[PDB]
Structure 1
């Protein structure tokens, strides 16, 4: 098989919340395929990124608890400093296609990330689902408009 299974949990101010399912990651000739099996999300498109650190723990920023802050920022080993989505090599390597949530709150639609080649590249990082969407740009809102971190899972 050669797959990874990532358990995803809601992210709260105090710590980890409810489990919402798993994402199965597989290798294809065209890149990594993220097949979700999730529930408990708001219907629509959600920002979906690999973050640098292997943690989903909440942390303090400017005096306020921030869910899943300890995952750090979007995975960016090339130091692009730019959020440009899964089809643009000028931005964060961790930028994945938006996560598609169905009307019934489940996520099932598989997502191809063609800039990622090997499951090894995900180990030691985290997967993040944001409250908002992802227009694959830093404008008009930074980081695609994803906003707050809703659910997260550590890879390894």
Structure 2
């Protein structure tokens, strides 16, 4: 079985747009995230589980900012460090980056070896960023994902 996460491209002004789903399954080596997404910007994108079960915007420094309602990276073990999916020093929410092909589709599965059971990711959000992910806070915070492009709540 699979958790089916509906994902939307975020637009706080005009309303989110559906871009498909990400399926989460259990493998013998951890949780697999299998995207079935469309109409996204081509490239490799930061892909993380964020703390709050929300994809809503929040105002910050006078701005209505996409996805801020999700809070920060999911970090139950309180490492306070963005890092690699296979590093025990990194946020539990840190997943391998997600590849979107030329035609805007994403169908390449990725493994989160530190996550072991479907139950454990529910009540959090799944975030796809505009930027990539160097799995460090240096030199850009949170791997340089930057803006929150697409998001779905894990239920």
TM range (shorter): over 0.9
Find the counterpart in structure 2 of residue 69 from structure 1.
68
Q: Deviations over 1:21-63 (max 9, x none)?
A: 0001100000000000001111111000000000111111121
Unaligned runs of 5+ in 2: none
1:5-154 matches, cutoff 5 A: 5-14=4-13, 16-154=15-153
Distance in 2 (alpha carbons) for counterparts of 1:85 and 1:12 = 29
How far did residue 15 of structure 1 move?
A: 6.9
**What number of residue pairs does the alignment pair up?**
155
Structure 1: where are the runs of 5+ without partners? none
Inter-CA distance 19–29: structure 2 relative to 1 (3 Å threshold): same
Displacement of 1:13 in angstroms is 2.7
TM-score normalised by length of structure 1: 0.96
Cα RMSD for the two superposed structures: 1.0
Q: Using structure 2 for the length normalisation, give the TM-score.
A: 0.97
